Structures are given as structure tokens and as C-alpha cells.
Design a protein around this ligand. Structure first.
Ligand SMILES: OC[C@H]1O[C@@H](O[C@H]2[C@H](O)[C@@H](O)[C@H](O[C@H]3[C@H](O)[C@@H](O)[C@H](O)O[C@@H]3CO)O[C@@H]2CO)[C@H](O)[C@@H](O)[C@@H]1O
Ligand SMILES: [Cl-]
Ligand SMILES: [Cu+2]
Length: 235
């Protein structure tokens, strides 16, 4: 149970984005139905009044929280991966539009899931803004909590992989468009009952065997991190 509070751009806090530049849902409950319209941008997908200006190459940091800013972030039980996707904003997230910019699942070196490291990072994970066409985008940050993912939601709706989905409105101003954004995957649709990484038993199956759901990270993606960029406590 987690939400996005706001974003940072090059280590500068853009301030509370909830219902302002984040298409915030009404609460921190997960989406679980893989065929739900709610898979796009969570349960209250609509245009919000602001879009954060960035340039290609900026560090864009998402900041998550549980109940209040810079708290426990997400229950430690919620082990799983983190991904970020991008789509042109005129799509409203519909159709074959979502392109993956970032994946982090289980780090064998550190013996930790992405969610475990997100807690340590005070809820912060970042991407480099890609060199796509200037204009308005949706950045879809997705945490998958796997603590009940041994079941398919379609078999037992009390369980299943849990999707914490947050769409941020981002405007890319300066970009040379050296990597034009291709068509991508649909949400809902890209994840199905048979997709690798959706049904996974963290109690019996080693995390060293986990394969995160496709699609693969786009060749145009410039990278990212799970690390505290900004200190919310200094404000
Ligand atoms: O026992 C089932 C699993 O519970 C997980 O805890 C979650 C609770 O089930 C859930 O009711 C609670 O929801 C809170 C939410 O955290 C809070 O932010 C909001 O204000 O109110 C909700 C209640 O209406 O969330 C917790 C997760 O934080 C355990 O984490 C898990 O191990 C356990 O299997
Ligand atoms: Cl939960
Ligand atoms: Cu939860």
C-alpha cells in the first residue's frame, strides 16, 4: 500500500503533486485485475491541472510514501520489482503506447528486491529523461508486490500480484529527439495470467530465479537508480 507524493528534477523537489501533476487514485490500495481499465493509470485516470517541465537527460525522481511523506514507504512484506514506462500524453495511456524505461527486480549482488531498496532510499527511484520528441508524456511508475502472487488473482481474488501504479504528467521541453519513441505495449493487456513474473511464489521459489514481466527495457532508455536523491527532512 503506497502512493507517489511528488517528483524531483535534478535533485530539486517539484513539491506535492497529489491530484496536481500526479493522476492520484483515492487511496493506496493495489490494482490486481490484469484486464482492468485500472491497469493503465490506476483507478482515477484523468487529466490533472499541471505537467512537470523537464529536459532530455534530466534525472527524474519519483517519491513514494505509505501514509505520510517520508514514512515507512511501503510494508516490508511487499517484496517485488519496480518498472517505469512512458507514453505520449495524448494517448491517455490507451492503445499500444507504453515503452519501458526502467526495470529492477531482484539484485543478486545485494540479495535484495527493488522494493526493499526503495524503502532504504526513502521512497525514491529515478530515470534519465529520454531523448524523445518534445511534448507531453505520462510516466507510469509501477511497483509489483509479490507477497500473495503464488495465486493468480483470476483464481483467487483475495490474492494475486499487486500493482501500485502512478502516472505523472511530464512535459519534455528541450530534446534533440535522437531516440524517437516507438509504439509500445498496452495496459491493460501486456500482463496476462501466463506472463513470466506475474504468478510467483516468493516463499518456495528462489528470487534468483525471478524473471520480471516483459516487455524488455527499450534500447533508447538511458538508465536510472533506486537511491535517495533529495532529503525531504531539510524542507
Ligand atoms: O494479512 C494480509 C497482509 O496484510 C498486509 O498489510 C496490509 C493490510 O492488509 C491492509 O489492510 C493495510 O491497509 C491500510 C493501509 O496500509 C493504510 O495506509 C490505509 O490508510 O488503510 C488501509 C486499511 O484500510 O495495508 C497493509 C500494508 O501496509 C501485510 O503487509 C502483509 O504481510 C499481510 O500478508
Ligand atoms: Cl497488502
Ligand atoms: Cu499493501
Amino acid at each position: 500500500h503506497t502512493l507517489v507524493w511528488g517528483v524531483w528534477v535534478n535533485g530539486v523537489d517539484q513539491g506535492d503533486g497529489r491530484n496536481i501533476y500526479i493522476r492520484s487514485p483515492p487511496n493506496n490500495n493495489p490494482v490486481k485485475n490484469l484486464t482492468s481499465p485500472d491497469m493503465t493509470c490506476n483507478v482515477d485516470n484523468r487529466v490533472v491541472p499541471k505537467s512537470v517541465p523537464v529536459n532530455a537527460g534530466d534525472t527524474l525522481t519519483f517519491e513514494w510514501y505509505h501514509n505520510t511523506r517520508d514514512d515507512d514507504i511501503i510494508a516490508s512484506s511487499h517484496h517485488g520489482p519496480i518498472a517505469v514506462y512512458i507514453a505520449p500524453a495524448a494517448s491517455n495511456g490507451q492503445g499500444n503506447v507504453w515503452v519501458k524505461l526502467f526495470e529492477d527486480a531482484y539484485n543478486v549482488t545485494n540479495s535484495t528486491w527493488a522494493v526493499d531498496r526503495l524503502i532504504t532510499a526513502h521512497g525514491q527511484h529515478s530515470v534519465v529523461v529520454p531523448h524523445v520528441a518534445p511534448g507531453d508524456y505520462l510516466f507510469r511508475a509501477e511497483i509489483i508486490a509479490l507477497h500473495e502472487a503464488d495465486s493468480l488473482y483470476s483464481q483467487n481474488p483475495i490474492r494475486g500480484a499487486q500493482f501500485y501504479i502512478s502516472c505523472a504528467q511530464i512535459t519534455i521541453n528541450s530534446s534533440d529527439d535522437s531516440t524517437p519513441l516507438p509504439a509500445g505495449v498496452p495496459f491493460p493487456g501486456a500482463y496476462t495470467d501466463s506472463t513470466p513474473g506475474i504468478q510467483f511464489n516468493i516463499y518456495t521459489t528462489p528470487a534468483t530465479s525471478y524473471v520480471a514481466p516483459p516487455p524488455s527495457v527499450w534500447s533508447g532508455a538511458l538508465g536510472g537508480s533506486i537511491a535517495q536523491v533529495g532529503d525531504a527532512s531539510l524542507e
